[model samples]
Target: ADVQQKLAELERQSGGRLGVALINTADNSQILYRADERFAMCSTSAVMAAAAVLKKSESEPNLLNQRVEIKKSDLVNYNPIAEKHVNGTMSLAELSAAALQYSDNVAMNKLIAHVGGPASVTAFARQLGDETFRLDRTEPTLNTAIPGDPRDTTSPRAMAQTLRNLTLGKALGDSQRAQLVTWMKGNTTGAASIQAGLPASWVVGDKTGSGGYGTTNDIAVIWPKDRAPLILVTYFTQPQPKAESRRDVLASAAKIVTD
Candidate 1:
């Protein structure tokens, strides 16, 4: 309760809408605010795509080694990794790694296509017992982030739950979960958000997303040196379409949760 009050004050002081879920995975204790409210999924959906692919690979053992070609037309905005591989062949494992670590637009699109489109990611989440998460469209288009739209949005609680199941819970085999954690730890996009708020000694693995109307998100598994791992999800947004993301609000909120 005290943490919620601190988070409430933090959100009020920031002037940006916030949704947060902080869970102590060892004990299942949580601090949630707007936990059930919907927020844009943005590129953080890449993590879901990666997790789904990993899950599928468990049954189709040959899937990851399968190489697929990337074409110029397959490209989308913010595709540094995919752009380099355009017209080249990349293994499924490579694609998943690129999508998770770089949030590459084309990489995620191809993974979505490979996994049977946007709804399939939702199906994967459903199988994980997540009823509130949804992914309606592919990238670029999915990033529209209209203030009231439900498409491609998830509640903080649901996202955190899904991450818990995939990363530190029972949804994946040990090795598959480890692979996801490796990629998340190598993620390059969250420096200004959750990662920035925590003490350097606390290890973290996370995925981040940003979209229109100032939507920004980061979901992480953090290991404080003295205790069990914790899972944290923060989603931020502003009311105007042209507004810039308030990532610092996310950092502040993370600090409040940890303290």
Candidate 2:
């Protein structure tokens, strides 16, 4: 009843749409909850896109050094963060960081073009043993979304497993996995989600995604004080946009699961 009640409480605070996963990466103990329909992963998929680049680059080292001109006009809308340093050419690794760290749309689409297509991200997910996480789309901007068009999707159970595998270094080399966590930690994004829950000294490497009115998501690897790190993936959405409650829900869930 501990989590059931906690889940309901989180849901009540989640604006009626929510799903979450809490996994102890060390022992594989997990708690998962989800809505029936998959929620759009938003920018959370950028990390997987990064993984695809890292995965394929093992066989093709040239991919890492490949460079491309990041044309800002190709993007559907403007992102101050992604556009801040936009001058000219960027290598694959730099683009991946732009996408992963700041959720840059133009950079991600460029990476998508380099990796073959949008489906390559889903393929990478499959390689990591997460079949349910689907990457059927790419974003040129938040405004480019078509009515009912493909949106990247995933469930809590699936995400928990992927995060677990990422933490466990399932398919990637130690260096690659380590870099991905570092990139997520360096993510220059929001402060609300999982990071908002932890104390100053608690180390949590994370990535955040937000779009579609009130949709809010944060996934992370938290280095706990008592033991090895754990994985937490929290998502929330609602018909009417309400942002603050979602952050509170995530922070509350963090307290429940950790302390």
Candidate 3:
């Protein structure tokens, strides 16, 4: 109740709707605020695509070593790394890194194709028993963030469960799981969001996303010194006449949960 109240207060002060989920793997405790509410995923889909690739790679030997083609027509807006690799080939490993660590849209689309398409990511989440996580389209289109639309959306609780399975459960092998965590830890885009609220001593791996309708989000797996890992997800979206995303609201959201 206390955590929920704090989050509600934060949402009110920030002038946006907020959804949060915090899970402690040690005791299996949870704190949620509008946790089952749907929200746009934006670039955070990178984590899901990366995890699906790693999960699929376990059964397909040499999957990461395969060279994937990138044509100019395959590029999407905000593709920092993909644009660089257009008309070239990138190893699946490189594509996964670019998508997860840099949130590269082009790399993400390629990764999605590598995993068999957008439905494959939803299949991956469903296999983990997460029904609320779904990807209906590729980048740019998926980022539309239309209010009340369910396509390309996830409930905070469903996303937290999916993250837990990928990061700590049997969904991935040890080495592959480590690689995903490393990529998230190296994410170049989380500084203004959840990362700002965390202390240096806590080991953190996170992915961030933003889109139309003032949607911005960060999801993380955190290992505070000497304790079991904690998974935190914060999703924010404002309604019509949408303002710029309130990235800093995520920091306050994290503080409310952690405190």
Candidate 4:
């Protein structure tokens, strides 16, 4: 197929391993082009955290706007604030937004704590229909801890499914979906991946995750002109020596998928 050929060419040009899975989120249709379909990695925690908040908001009416306090001690090891400006407080909503938008580790850890920790987040993922996806409680950072059990993980396919559920309004209610999408649209890192590949005018809602030593991932909803919106997940892990090289690899593959 032309899609496969193009993807192959992209992989050769990019100089790093790549895997992509896409779904017409509007209709749940597959649009896949990849070298390996089984490749999996840790992705954004935003979906699970956002779902947790949304679900709680539905049952306890006051939860959505209720601002929980975030203290300096909540800062994660990699948080910029942990190094530069600790000892400040932020609301739960601001913390969650920081987690989603800036990929703030401290904010994510704090939000995960607020959402009842990693077990609750994994449960929320299951509720959103991701049976194969899992998160490890002991793994504090994205790349540091190798999972004792790799079975507790997610593939690109499962990632796409989660995004599709959010876009189709199946996981969260209208208002909550709006809030989730708003946060997704604010993602900062890896912008040249899924976001850069799409049309300049198209509105993209996405979140990106990167692990040390060239592990990067992105989940995005591309609002196209002709067809229904598409959900795409691209995950890559390159050798430590070629870490910087892999970022370009992911970016080029993104261009192929979106083009």
lDDT per residue (tens digit) for residues 38-149 in model 4: 3435446566776687777777776755665545666555565333435555666676677777777776776677778778888888877777666655224544313233
Give Cα-based local distance difference scores for all models.
0.90, 0.72, 0.88, 0.67
Model 2, C-alpha of 173: deviation from truth (Å): 0.9
> What ranking of all candidate models by lDDT puts the best one first?
1, 3, 2, 4
Identify the candidate with maximal TM-score.
1
**lDDT, candidate 1, at 127:** 88
TM-score of each: 0.97, 0.88, 0.96, 0.85
Number of colliding residue pairs in model 1: 0
In the range 45-160, model 1's lDDT, one tens digit per residue, is 89889899889989998998989899988888889898888778999888888888888888899889999999998999898899998999998989999988999999999999
**Per-residue lDDT of model 3, residues 9-37, tens digit only:** 88998778899999999899999889989
Off by over 4 Å in 1: none
Q: What is the C-alpha RMSD of each candidate to the true structure, in Å?
A: 1.1, 2.8, 1.3, 3.0
- Rank list by TM-score: 1, 3, 2, 4
Who is ahead in TM-score, 2 or 4? 2
State the local distance difference test value for candidate 2: 0.72
Which candidate gets the maximum lDDT versus the true structure?
1
1-259 per-residue lDDT for model 2 (tens digits): 7876887877875555777888886676877777334776777777777888888887886877787775656553535444664666788888888787777777777777777777887887887788887777667443222224346778877786687677555667787888778877787774667877777677787777777646678788888777788888887766654333356667776777666
